[PDB]
Design a binder for this molecule. Structure first.
Ligand SMILES: [Ca+2]
Ligand SMILES: [Ca+2]
Ligand SMILES: [Ca+2]
Ligand SMILES: [Ca+2]
Length: 238
């Protein structure tokens, strides 16, 4: 005998350049064997998401596995999770096809804007030793510029803080500088730079009645940055 994929399932980052797909030969190794593979489309398109590939996996006498590089294509357009597969045909004569003989590889986008939130909800700190950066994390993922307001609230102890953080591309983290009592500090809602080419196209899609949005457009709409659970932090001062 038998010949079958293993791993029979690979998960892969759109930016992984490529990755190995491994195949196994059980049963009578002793003699050369072989088998073919062909990438074939799922939701992930050969052409846009990966490259098509038929091939011949040769198994000289004494080898019960072959790997083989598949290329995952990278781009800057937000897409949901996508799929594509790889099938074993044409085994050599000695041998039967097993389970699985269809490998599944999924492409994870990384063109989201994306989702913004604090790390924890409470941070204990020190009567007066100055400053001390309050982190803000950007979750999966880190495409486009995203601007995002910040202001503080009272609960004399600190100086009030306001602004708009600017996460440029692949900016995943940024910091608010401040500057037993507590106060809260909020984050508003993320928006793109008003004038980043994307913010427009989306504005365009954002008028086509939803019933009109091309599938492409519907997925362009949820490319937009969002907020997470905790959009507020308390600061305890002791
Ligand atoms: Ca695609
Ligand atoms: Ca993709
Ligand atoms: Ca993409
Ligand atoms: Ca990408």
């Amino acid at each position: 005998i038998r010949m079958y994929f293993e791993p029979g399932h690979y998960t892969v980052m759109e930016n992984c350049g490529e990755f190995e797909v491994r195949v196994v030969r059980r049963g009578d190794i002793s003699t050369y064997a072989s088998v073919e593979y062909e990438t074939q489309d799922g939701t992930a398109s050969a052409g846009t998401d990966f490259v098509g590939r038929k091939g011949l996996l040769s198994f000289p006498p004494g080898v019960d596995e072959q790997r083989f590089r598949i290329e995952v294509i990278d781009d800057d357009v937000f897409e949901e999770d996508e799929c594509f597969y790889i099938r074993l045909f044409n085994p050599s004569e000695g041998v039967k096809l097993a389970v699985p003989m269809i490998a599944t590889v999924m492409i994870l986008d990384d063109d989201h804007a994306g989702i913004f939130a604090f790390t924890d909800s409470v941070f204990e700190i020190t009567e007066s030793v100055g400053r001390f950066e309050l982190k803000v994390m950007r979750y999966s993922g880190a495409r486009g510029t995203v601007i995002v307001p910040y202001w503080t609230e009272n609960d004399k102890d600190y100086e009030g803080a306001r602004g708009e953080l600017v996460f440029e591309n692949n900016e995943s983290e940024k910091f608010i500088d401040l500057f037993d009592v507590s106060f809260k500090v909020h984050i508003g809602e993320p928006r793109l730079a008003p004038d980043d080419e994307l913010a427009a196209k989306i504005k365009e899609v954002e008028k086509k009645p939803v019933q009109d949005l091309t599938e492409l457009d519907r997925i362009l709409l949820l490319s937009k940055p969002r907020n997470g659970e905790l959009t507020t932090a308390y600061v305890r001062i002791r």
